[PDB]
Each structure stands twice: as C-alpha cells, then as structure tokens.
Amino acid sequence: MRECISIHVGQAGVQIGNACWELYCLEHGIQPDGQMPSDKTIGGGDDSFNTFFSETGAGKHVPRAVFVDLEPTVIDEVRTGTYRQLFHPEQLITGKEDAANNYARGHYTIGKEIIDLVLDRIRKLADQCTGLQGFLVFHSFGGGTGSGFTSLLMERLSVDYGKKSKLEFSIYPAPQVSTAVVEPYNSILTTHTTLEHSDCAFMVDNEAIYDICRRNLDIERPTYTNLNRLISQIVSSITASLRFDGALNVDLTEFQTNLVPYPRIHFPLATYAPVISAEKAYHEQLSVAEITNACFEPANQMVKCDPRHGKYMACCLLYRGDVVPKDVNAAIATIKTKRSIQFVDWCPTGFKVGINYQPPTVVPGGDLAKVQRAVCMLSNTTAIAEAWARLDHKFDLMYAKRAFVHWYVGEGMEEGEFSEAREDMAALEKDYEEVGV
Amino acid sequence: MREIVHIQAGQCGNQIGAKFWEVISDEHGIDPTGSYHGDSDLQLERINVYYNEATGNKYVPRAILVDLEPGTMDSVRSGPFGQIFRPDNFVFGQSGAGNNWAKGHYTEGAELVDSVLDVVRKESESCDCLQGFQLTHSLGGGTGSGMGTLLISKIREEYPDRIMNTFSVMPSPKVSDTVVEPYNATLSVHQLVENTDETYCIDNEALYDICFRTLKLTTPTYGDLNHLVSATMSGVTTCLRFPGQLNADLRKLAVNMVPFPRLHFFMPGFAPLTSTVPELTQQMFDSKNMMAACDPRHGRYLTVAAIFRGRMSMKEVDEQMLNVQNKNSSYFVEWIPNNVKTAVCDIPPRGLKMSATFIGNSTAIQELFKRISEQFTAMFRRKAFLHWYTGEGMDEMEFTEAESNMNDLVSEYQQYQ
Amino acid sequence: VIELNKCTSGQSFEVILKPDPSLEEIQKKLEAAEERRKYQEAELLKHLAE
Amino acid sequence: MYTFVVRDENSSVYAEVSRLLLATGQWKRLRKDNPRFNLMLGERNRLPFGRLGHEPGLVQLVNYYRGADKLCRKASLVKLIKTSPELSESCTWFPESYVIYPTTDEREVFLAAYNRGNVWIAISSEASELLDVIQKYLEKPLLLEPGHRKFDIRSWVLVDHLYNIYLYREGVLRTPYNSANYGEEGNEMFFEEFNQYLMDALNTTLENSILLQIKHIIRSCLMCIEPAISTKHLHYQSFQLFGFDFMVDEELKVWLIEVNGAPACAQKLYAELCQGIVDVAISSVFPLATSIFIKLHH
C-alpha cells in the first residue's frame, strides 16, 4: 500500500478538493467525524483506501490532504464544514491577502513567504507514509494562487521528492464564469513553469462543465457547487483505481506509463457518461454500448474539441458498476467501424479497460441521478491541443499591446518570462502538430 | 478584513461623501444612531469593509471628514446620519482655502495635513488586513483638489502597497463655479495619474443633463445631483460590500480594469435613473446616461465592469449584455479578449428592487482631459488669476509642467484608438 | 482480450484491434524578483521624498 | 441582430451572400478578426476551427465542413474510395485511379494495370511519357452535336448543419474531339437545353439518363464521410456548398471526375443559388421577419 497526498491550492483547488473528499467518504462509507464502521482493522491497516486515508488509534480516518490558499475565506468553509472533524488544523494553510489574479504575486511575492510553511505541513504528511507514491495537485489556471503558487510548489516538490510522481487536476479558464481578464496570462505562465514537473495533468474546461450542467442537468445558471460536484465525480472515477482493489492504474507511475508516451504531451482528454438529471429520477437505464459510444461524443468531454481531427496515442476506459468484459468488447467492436478512431502509427490501436463493480456514488440532495453503470474514458489525443491554441491566441492579442503586464513586472517578474513561456507553448503546439498528422 | 478607509475632503467631497454613507447605511441596515435594524443578516456579512464595531452593537463608518473651513462639516454633523460618524474623525481648519489649490496643497493644507494622517493612522491600526483607501472630493476647488491630492501623496508614502481609490468630481465649462477651476483641476489630474490606482470620473455637466433631460427636472440643485452620485457610489461598491466573485476587492478590480498604469480613469453609469432587463440594460449603456461629459462613441472601451443588483433571471441579462456588445461592436478593443465582465448582487438598493451600474475604462475620457487642458492654456497664457498661486510660493514652471503632463495623458489615450 | 486480471472488486483487461532547477537556482530566481521589487519601491520613495 | 464576418474576399458566391445578408438589415458585418460573431464566411485555407463555438451565449455557424478535404483532394479522393468499404472496389462510377509522389504510394501497382485501349491522364497515350495522380482517360466520351464536342457536368450541392444533402436543380455543362476558341453563350449549356438535346438526338431525358446516377454519386460520396465531419452534437455548426464535376460516356454512364469545396457559379445562377444558400443554410439557424433544391434523402 503506497500512499497518495492530495494538495489543494487556491479557491478552485480547495472547493473542488472538498467536493472530492466528501464523495470519497461516501464511496468508502466514512462518516463526517472520520469513523468508518465498515473498517474492521482499528488504528491502521494496509487496505486500498489507506492510500488516501490515514488512521488514528482512535479510529478516525484522516485524509492525506493539505489545503492551501492565500485568503482565509475559502479554507474557513472547510473548517465549519460537514466533514470538518476529518481534518486537523495543520492540514489547512491560510494567508491573509491573496494574489489578486496575479501569477507573479502568487509565485514570487506571496509564494516566497509561505512556501516553507506549506512544505513543512506537507512533510508532516509524508512523514506518516510507509511508501509515498507522490502527489495529486488541484488548482485553477486563472487564479493568482492556483497558477502562481502552484508552479512554485511543483518546482519545490520535484526537489524535495525527486523520485515521486505528480499528477494535476487543472481548471482551464472559461469567460462564462471567469472572474478575470488576465487568466490567459496566468494560464500560459503556470503551464510553462509546471511542465517539466508534472507527470500527468487532467485539464477541466469550466466551459465544458458549465455546458454539461445546463444540457444534461437542466440548470439555468450553474453554481461552482454544481460544477464542483460534477468535477468531483470525474476525479473520483479517475482516482478510483488508486483507492480500490484492482490492476489498472494502481500506482501514480502507471498513469504516465499507460497515458503518456511523450513526457511533454501529458494532458489526456477525459470524457464522462452518463450525466442524468436527478429531478427526473425515472429515466431510461443506459447500456454499456450506449455509455461507451457517448465517450466519443464531444458534448461529454471535459474539454470541448474534436478527437476525429487528431490522433490517439493511448486510450483507457474506466467503468463503474454493473459491467462485464463481454459487453465492453461488443461495444468497442461496433464503435470502431462506426466512428473515426485513428491512432498514431508507433502505437497499437488499443483500449485498456478497468471495471469497478461498485456503482457510482451520488451526493444526497445533489443534482445527479444515480446510475447502475458509468464510464470515464481517459484518452491522450492531439485534439486537446485546440485548447492550447485558443489560449495562446488570447495571450497574443493582449501581449502585443503589453496590456496588464505592469502588474506582473511590479511584483518583480521580468517581462522576459512572458515571451519565454509563450515560446514554450508555441513549441508545445508544434509537438502536438508533429504527432497529430 | 478587508477594510477600506474612507476619506472625504472639501465641500463637494463631504457633501457627496455624507450622502454616500446615508445610502449604504440604509442598505446594510444601519440607523442614524449606529444600531443595526436590518432584516436580512446578509447585510452584516461584509459590513466590516466600511464599518468598525463598538460596544453596544454600534456600527461606525470608518470615515475621515476633512475640510479647511468648518462650514460644510458642521452641516454634515447636523445632517441625517450626522451622529454616526466618530466625533473625533472630524478634522478641520479655520482659514479656508479660497478655492485655491496652492493653499490646499502647499500652505494651509500642509498645516492641517499631519493631524489628518494621525486619524488615518489610527483607523488603519484597527484593521486586521487593510485593503486601501477611498477618497471623495472635487478637482475644481481648493481643499478637495489641493489638500485631497496632498493627502493621497502622503498616504502613498506611508502605505506604499495599498490601493488608492477616488471618486473625483471634475469641472465643466457648462457649469459655472470658481473662475480658477481649470487651474485646480489640471494641477490635480497629474497627482491622480501618479498616485491613484482607480479614479471614478464624474462631472456636473453630465449629472445636470441627466437631471434635466432624463429626470425632467427644470433647474437642478446640488441635492439632485448628489442623489445620482450617491446611488452610483453605492453601485460601484456593491461588489465590495456584498458577497461575490467578480471584482471582490480593490486590487482585483484594478487588475481587471487597468491595462496600463496611467489609464485608470473610469466613467460610471447608473440605471434606472432615479429622481425591464432589456430596458434597464439599454439605459446603463446609453451615451446620454454617462456621469461624465464625454461621448463613449468617440473612443473605445478597454474594460467594462457591469454590476446588476436585484432579483432577475440573469439568463436574459446575459442575452441583453451580448446584444449590447454586438450592437455597439466597434466600441470595444479587440486585443483585450472578454473585456466586459458581469457581476450580480441579490440585495437591491433602497426602493428600486432592480438596478444596474456601469463602470467603463474608455479612451473617450481623453476629451474630458483635453477640454480642461484648453481652458488651462487659455488662462495661463494670459497668466490670469496666477498671482493667487505664486503668492503661495508656486513657480510658473510647475504650471507649465502640469499642462504638458495633461497633454501627455490625452496623447496616451490617443495611442489606443 | 489480453491480460485479464480479476478480483472481487472488479476486473481489468486490454483489447488490441490493430498494431531541472535546483534548490539554489530556485532561491536565486526568487530573491532576484525580490530585489527588483525593492528597487522599484525604493525609486518610488525617492520620488516621494523629492 | 445577427453578426457575420468574411475571411475570403476572393469568394464570389458569398460576396453575394454577404450582400444579401446586409440587404436584409437583420445582419451586421463585423471586422474580419472579431471573435463575437454568429456566422463566419471562412477563409479558403487553414480555417481556425479550434476557436469556433467557444463564445458564451453565441450560436456560431461556419460555411465549411472541417475534414471535408478528404473528398476534395485528388490523392485524398482516391485514398477514400480505395479504403472506404462504403465505396471500395464496389465502386464503378469512378475511373481506375492511382496516386504517386514526385521524386508511401501507388506507383508500382499502376504498372500492372497498364500492362494488362490504354489512354491515361494526369493527356498521354503511352506510359513512360507520363512519368514526367494517374486516371484512365475516358477514350469513349459523349460528344455533343453538332460540333462533336466534349463537355462536363457541374452540379452544385448544399449540405446544411443537419446534413441534409441539397441538389441545386440548375446544373451546367461546361463544353472537336481527336481520338488517338469559344462561342450556346460562353460554352455554358444549361439543363433545359441539354435535356432537349438528349430528347431529340437520343430519345431520353436528362433525368433518366444522367441525373439519377448524379444523385446516386452525390449521396454515396457525402454519406461516406458523414460520420467524420458531421456537426450534429458539435459545439459549433457548419454547412458547405460543393461543386461536383461529372462526365458522361458513350453509353450514357456517368463518371465522377472532381469534387470542388470552393466552387464558383454560373452568372445567371448566382442570384438564385446564393439566395437559396441564405434561405436553406443561413436563415435556418438564424430566423428573420417552392424550392430550388432537390434534397437527396438518406
């Protein structure tokens, strides 16, 4: 049993973390006070769920998690939260003044002063780890803390835990809920600095989540609460293999092995189905072939883009609930002839499949219907590069006029770090381009 | 936290400022005695941003009232909500400034300034995490303009990394007041360009036009104008006084509104003008609805922050917004993607239920500054009324300097259109 | 269906259809940013002193 | 108030379409690189599809089908017909074709065909003098009379966002044939005339003898790649006008020659066709205040 430490950074990472950890407790049957009756071993054990939960001699199951933010408003919501008894004070790190949506502020000014403290609380966790695999890092692209401080923490984590894996869950900026005009700046800056430091990153485009929340869940103006509950489901199905008995992706390193042939191209596209509205809890029960076919419909992707116009280099299918291998094979055979699925030449046209018999858990009073079977497909297609392009374009529009740049220079960042990061991205776009056709 | 320290200076500053505290007291549920009588406990959530708490559940406006003559501030003290201000936060002189920037900035102002900063320093010492400062004043006069800007320079020196915000009433040739307004406004604009992060620009010519043409008021008074201003001051501070994600604090607002450091002069707008969604959205974006003279169609918008307030679909608000972004179309810069942001607050202003507030960083404001520049030049070349300034020790060169600083500002706006 | 692993929680298989910065370097870049801030702020205060 | 942008000034058809749109008042043309638009009349090459359908509260339509270049490239069309089971060797309306690159491809296999009348084109008679795509030349074309003159059929096809395949009822024949000058006006023979000829000379109609195969070929080609380029559940919608080029041989068999993704139009047919494009392609997604199309069902 190798442990995993989850690190939640800034508002998005924090609020999403809370939604995820709530779900984990429900999935593992853990009470909001840390008690878990289902657990027969008291004071410890090497069970699968111990990769995410420590155990105190008193029987409290404590998340291997650390929440960090430069403003106390969001962390406090965790302290007064339903699952507050889970966490202890050392896990929640909070500053006084935030990064004001300024990458330079999160990275250089504020970051420098709080980095050691965050590392100490992180070390306190690792110190309780028999065989730490590495870290799961949640954060947004657009925020000053999520972009600026995350990149610094990643740089340090590489130094202090050299032989440990780091995966990200990154929230990609969408103006439909975006709170800042400089998010394209912060995005490129943090992607540039984190790139050589992240083994595998799952981008989630708020545009996609927001749209799914409207179309599938019938919601006029989706809340972060609404978005974060859907995001937590997907994160849950991506992490399920680390928390339950299995053979597919039981280690953080297996994630890069199966999904990332090329180090720099480490952003797999996630697609999820089915998403049903709970208010109408009388719906038709989708089949294995149907939810599988839905993974290739752009409208269920975490990032809106067209996989038909790129190449795959790895594809993993994660099923939850009532599913046997027999049906998956039939569903894949029929879909292959039916849809445009083109792998890179130096890769076998193959699908890795995992099935967890336990059906997806829903939060009570939530917005999602419970379903007897769901699937999350992780696929490394070059099509996701569309996102990088979109983002680089908006960056170029502003930077040509040096708009908002003085805010960054004023924090001690040199202007050269902009053109440095943008060149790195142009290079990245080229890498997808090469692989893509 | 995060607390804002409010400073109001001069006649205009204190009269506009006093009304502002009236309207937002009435929104946070604070009575003229400082007791809370609000129905929703949602008002109390961000109350700390503008109020200190004392014994006996008393809420006291973190505000400093400053003048060089006792007049206006005795009028505040005797006015409604007069007693809610700390007695000790009244700082005033006896000599007056005589509408003279030099007196406000260099002589009479200098004698009073330190004791103003003593009050400022004691209000800040009581802040868990001080956010910055908000100054209300006019530019046309002597105390608000001259001593207001001296204050800003002092504040900056002591609090170098706090946001400095101001609501600044500019003079117009349409509205006759002191003959030396062009001198005072010009000397002040340079101060603002250097030492504030955000300046809301309004002038009485535009507020007059609104009160006259829109509100059908034959002959407007200070009372009528200040009603508009106080309402607009409530709107653009909505995002600071109630829970929300967009423009949460001053620094984040500044980061989203200010592409280039020197261009931080905003034109505010309000709807409905007080004496449907599409109608409400149409007004606030209307040219004849701006709080300053310049026509927004003469330039482009670098950034726009719209705050809707009340109970509304917001589905349609998103619709109406984009209907404006495309109906105008030509008036938004294309090199700042998604430069129009929309915020929404549930609690509507007193007696409206529905409301909107416009905040535009428009290059069209350059006309405002060019106009004042031409006035200043017309006078300065004849050296008319100049002896009131050199009499206080000012050099002619300092005038030539502020003139070209002005033209520089007008030129910088010119680059971006 | 190659590599079919099976347990009480589920099963997994595979279908085939066709065949950096050190601690000092980080510290330096951080401290450099700090120096530039301090310089920028020193220039402001000198200006305010004049 | 709908907004559009033009990114191919070189397009004559959408020059009209832009004229009509503006002439309806309910359409305002934005600056070429303005992100906030409803309809894009996109550029002929490297159209930035990845940036479409990403504007909040804005339904965006584009007049091109991404990926439709497989059916509009010489080497592509061969690769598609000889790969798609929908077509494959079970395709007898498209000439024996092989593709080769200039010094992998099909240069060695083309030989066995020529070895086993062998007039080919890429124009030439013998093989060796051709090396300096290869498709067997229709040595037995359908010569019009009088004049003994060759011709090709041009039909315009409109595929909307719902992927309805519309055949514009007006086609065009783009007119001495030596086995082994202009002036009909402008070498253009419209359907009413060509139908009359085929009736007098050959005792058949344009509909029976040629149009049936045309419609067949249209349906088959576009239906083949429909799963690759449809925008049914895409975050943006697209339509596109196609120019199919056919040839008719001696025994009235229709052959597919070309597929043009940026076709022009016969001058008389410009107004009527572009108007239809607006009505069927643009106004159908963006409403306003008899049919010139034959929809091939599927």
Ligand SMILES: CC(C)[C@@H](O)C(=O)N[C@H]1Cc2ccc3c(c2)[C@@]2(c4cc(F)ccc4N[C@@H]2O3)c2oc(nc2-c2nc(CO)co2)[C@H](C(C)(C)C)NC1=O
């Ligand atoms: C088109 C028209 C706008 C233009 O011809 C013009 O300049 N009119 C001046 C006339 C004027 C000039 C100077 C001046 C006042 C008025 C002035 C005034 C009038 C009094 F009876 C007693 C004191 C004062 N102080 C003010 O000083 C004033 O000006 C305007 N409002 C007020 C005022 N309102 C109040 C009530 O709150 C007191 O004073 C308004 C106002 C600033 C527009 C609200 N100004 C005027 O009416």
Ligand SMILES: Nc1nc2c(ncn2[C@@H]2O[C@H](COP(=O)(O)OP(=O)(O)OP(=O)(O)O)[C@@H](O)[C@H]2O)c(=O)[nH]1
């Ligand atoms: N999906 C999702 N997105 C969020 C959430 N909170 C914020 N965001 C997005 O994150 C981006 C803003 O970054 P934040 O996380 O709020 O900023 P931060 O990391 O806290 O850094 P600061 O500037 O110091 O506040 C915007 O694009 C938001 O839309 C959330 O709870 N869920």
Ligand SMILES: Nc1ncnc2c1ncn2[C@@H]1O[C@H](COP(=O)(O)OP(=O)(O)CP(=O)(O)O)[C@@H](O)[C@H]1O
């Ligand atoms: N196999 C074949 N037999 C006889 N004629 C042929 C032929 N292939 C092509 N042609 C002749 O080629 C002419 C049209 O050529 P083609 O369609 O290739 O244009 P093009 O490739 O030069 C550019 P575009 O696609 O825009 O027309 C027709 O008039 C037709 O007679």
Ligand SMILES: Nc1nc2c(ncn2[C@@H]2O[C@H](COP(=O)(O)OP(=O)(O)O)[C@@H](O)[C@H]2O)c(=O)[nH]1
């Ligand atoms: N809107 C508004 N403007 C005012 C008010 N009082 C004065 N002014 C304007 O302010 C300018 C005069 O400056 P003033 O504040 O009176 O002088 P000060 O006391 O030295 O700062 C003129 O342009 C007046 O029109 C007021 O109550 N409301």
Ligand SMILES: [Ca+2]
């Ligand atoms: Ca245990």
Ligand SMILES: [Mg+2]
């Ligand atoms: Mg924050």
